[PDB]
Amino acid sequence: KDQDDRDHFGKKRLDLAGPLLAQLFKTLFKKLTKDIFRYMQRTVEEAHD
Amino acid sequence: DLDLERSNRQVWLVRLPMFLAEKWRLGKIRINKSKITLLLNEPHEYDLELTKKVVENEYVFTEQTIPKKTAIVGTVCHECQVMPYHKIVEQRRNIVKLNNKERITTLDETVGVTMSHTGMSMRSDNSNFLKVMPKKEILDYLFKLFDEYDYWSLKGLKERTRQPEAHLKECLDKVATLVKKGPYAFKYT
């Protein structure tokens, strides 16, 4: 076989606003949990209301 | 301890579509010659497929360095695949691509009302969650504390004190020696 072709447009993909927001929002959502958990932890850590 | 019970049953494996799989979580094998058929209990007359005649080194077994109660029931005699009659089947098998989940209930309310509870709504706890003296009698108990258990911690003594904190801790500090670290620590011994 010939070596692979890297510019073959069949193997590209285009990230439109769907994906790009997803990749973005996803990480921004972790950060939201992590903080919630930490607060959730630290408040239980000190049995705060 | 394992037991090869008989392992000679001519078990026949069948591959089936999901609608069949769900229905299985009677029969009437109407084989005919090798155009093997069978009648299912009502449903259709779904024939068997000679999906794989010869099946070696394959056996059924059940159980009940930990051991367990093994039993070798039967051997695969031949493997079968379901033959779906096809009218409704293809009518639903093709229609197996006719399901999905829902979109988002984009909140039909006015915008104003919904945000009211987000800010300073001044309400809380609606969901319960993480809501959180005689020197004689003291010494008599202190001697009792010393006598009953020389390893008498303050908490085991203060709870047993059941009296003002002054008499137990102060009056007993003379004939009772309390260690700070180590095993017999805080022990009115």
Add this chain to the structure above:
Amino acid sequence: TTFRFCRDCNNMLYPREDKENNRLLFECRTCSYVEEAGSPLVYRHELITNIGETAGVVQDIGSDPTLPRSDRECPKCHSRENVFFQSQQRRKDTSMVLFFVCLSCSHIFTSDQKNK
């Protein structure tokens, strides 16, 4: 060429020289199974090849739309409906001969003149 595997071991049988009977046997460096040498040739290296000139000629090569048809008649079929294609040896020095394939007999022939 033509590797041989063991049985009850299933690994591959290296050749172990028998000097005493004075012939070649195939060992099995894991389980001691042995047998003869079905041929004294042991190894090939094959610098300049002529295989893959028909890579993957399946009974469907006739069913691929993109392949160029052609009209020549098969030496066997004497039918005149055949797909064709260059030698599938995707390498630079490769020649440019043509392999036809008759849609009827699935016989493979070539457009060659230097050597058929």
